[PDB]
Amino acid sequence: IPEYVDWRQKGAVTPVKNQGSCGSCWAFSAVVTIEGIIKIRTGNLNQYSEQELLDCDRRSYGCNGGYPWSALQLVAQYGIHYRNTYPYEGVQRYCRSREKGPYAAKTDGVRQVQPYNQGALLYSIANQPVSVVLQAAGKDFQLYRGGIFVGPCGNKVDHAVAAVGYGPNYILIKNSWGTGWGENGYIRIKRGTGNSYGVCGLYTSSFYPVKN
């Protein structure tokens, strides 16, 4: 369980993206999750469509609300297309999955990490990236243009992102905003403080598919 875990230089995460004026956090976080695992075994890095997840997942409320843990489940159940055969537009619409044709990616299950346990988060993040939530409605996290976020912030979780590494002290997160935020679309939050919930409630509820 290395002292350092970066999947970027591991060839697991692709360039950064933006959800835009679309409250669709959840589908983006997922595509990165599934994505990671998909490349971890096969040795093939891919960019899947979040747009599809939006238009297809009726359980989620597309362009403004969702469950990073429906998306995944969805995929495993059905599947998910490339981000070319289903590029992101930013507006929820009619499911094209079927109309689009044969799927391209399809997992083999979804599991959740025991909330409120850093030790647990890491491990999984060590075996493969994960979808995690937190407080973004933040007025500080909103302004982050590079650094180690300690706060201030709260325990009112409401935005989903992704963890793509950690250090002895900083946890790495991929944001669904442009590369005109944090440190090039990236933000480092601090771990090991005692805060069980985890600063910004980053330890509330996390997840991930399964792959054979």
Side-chain angles (χ1 to χ4, degrees):
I1 280 306
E3 189 172 5
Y4 299 92
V5 181
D6 186 277
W7 284 124
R8 303 196 291 162
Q9 90 174 115
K10 283 298 183 175
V13 359
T14 58
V16 170
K17 301 157 196 79
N18 171 14
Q19 54 194 105
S21 181
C22 175
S24 56
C25 68
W26 56 280
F28 269 86
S29 166
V31 343
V32 359
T33 63
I34 292 171
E35 235 167 33
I37 205 60
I38 292 295
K39 192 286 183 324
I40 307 292
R41 302 299 170 48
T42 63
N44 247 137
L45 182 62
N46 301 134
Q47 223 178 223
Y48 301 116
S49 163
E50 324 71 352
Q51 175 65 62
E52 165 174 28
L53 243 14
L54 206 217
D55 331 334
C56 244
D57 201 355
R58 280 332 156 130
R59 200 152 48 169
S60 288
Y61 333 76
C63 268
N64 76 157
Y67 310 117
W69 59 260
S70 203
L72 303 176
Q73 181 198 146
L74 226 224
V75 173
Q77 292 178 335
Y78 296 101
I80 188 178
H81 283 93
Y82 283 126
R83 227 208 158 197
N84 275 318
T85 64
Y86 224 140
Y88 174 65
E89 36 201 83
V91 185
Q92 155 187 244
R93 273 141 193 215
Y94 157 60
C95 189
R96 313 206 163 41
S97 297
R98 55 292 291 278
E99 154 176 334
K100 284 306 185 174
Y103 283 132
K106 168 178 191 187
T107 54
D108 273 301
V110 355
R111 281 157 197 216
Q112 167 183 48
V113 179
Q114 208 199 8
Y116 314 107
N117 180 347
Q118 154 183 160
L121 186 53
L122 318 191
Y123 197 112
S124 33
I125 296 189
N127 317 152
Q128 35 137 178
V130 197
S131 161
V132 117
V133 296
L134 56 61
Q135 183 178 87
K139 200 177 149 202
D140 304 279
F141 174 101
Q142 249 181 17
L143 274 175
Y144 167 88
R145 55 178 46 149
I148 297 301
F149 210 75
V150 118
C153 75
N155 312 300
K156 299 160 178 193
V157 133
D158 71 353
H159 183 42
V161 293
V164 296
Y166 77 75
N169 73 72
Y170 72 80
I171 286 198
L172 194 60
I173 302 292
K174 194 174 161 187
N175 195 25
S176 302
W177 295 358
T179 68
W181 180 99
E183 287 166 334
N184 285 66
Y186 285 105
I187 179 186
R188 329 151 67 163
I189 309 175
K190 181 181 267 307
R191 64 171 188 123
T193 187
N195 206 343
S196 197
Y197 293 142
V199 355
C200 300
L202 168 80
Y203 302 18
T204 309
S205 320
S206 315
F207 296 99
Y208 56 88
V210 171
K211 199 49 186 174
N212 295 333

